[PDB]
């Protein structure tokens, strides 16, 4: 089984930043549909991960769920942080995103930002109350995930 044509098109348009198509297809019913062919990302996951600000904004204004989790337990804030998208992260936080949320492996947005070397994101999450002592299932904190080269992020976290 696959998604409907309409849901496929909405998910694709979100990933693409095609806001006009998102506008045509986004309803209360479809705004939080899931990509059952992939990792069950919602339109907001795709827009957040691919840094599609106009679409992120539209989706949030039309009831997109900042708490929706994909197949691995990621919320859209995880996607924004993993890929270093500062404005998207701020928009998600402004619309109610919780910074201390964790995926199925207990990775938080801050673990993602730290591991990926995204300095500004880490600062933002901290500036917004993220807990730097949260361990994932490996027993690792975000600090533990910082590459040795990244002495500034280390400094930032501890």
């Amino acid at each position: 089984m696959g998604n409907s044509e309409a849901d496929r098109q909405l998910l694709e348009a979100a990933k693409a930043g095609d806001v006009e198509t998102v506008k045509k297809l986004c309803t209360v019913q479809s705004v939080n549909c899931r990509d059952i062919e992939g990792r069950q990302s919602t339109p907001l996951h795709f827009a957040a991960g691919y840094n599609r600000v106009s679409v992120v904004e539209y989706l949030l204004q039309h009831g997109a769920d900042v708490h929706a989790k994909d197949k691995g337990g990621l919320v859209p804030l995880h996607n924004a942080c993993s890929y270093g998208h500062y404005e998207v992260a701020e928009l998600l936080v402004k619309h109610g995103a919780v910074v201390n949320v964790a995926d199925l492996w207990k990775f938080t947005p801050l673990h993602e930002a730290a591991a990926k070397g995204k300095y500004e994101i880490c600062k933002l999450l901290l500036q917004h109350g993220a807990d730097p002592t949260k361990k994932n299932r490996d027993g690792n904190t975000p600090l533990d995930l910082v590459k040795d080269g990244d002495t500034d992020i280390q400094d930032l976290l501890r």
Binding site: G49, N51, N79
Partner: peptide
């Protein structure tokens, strides 16, 4: 097995 989120770092 843990995989990456949908997305990418750079628009270009």
């Amino acid at each position: 097995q843990r995989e990456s989120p949908d997305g990418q770092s750079f628009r270009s």
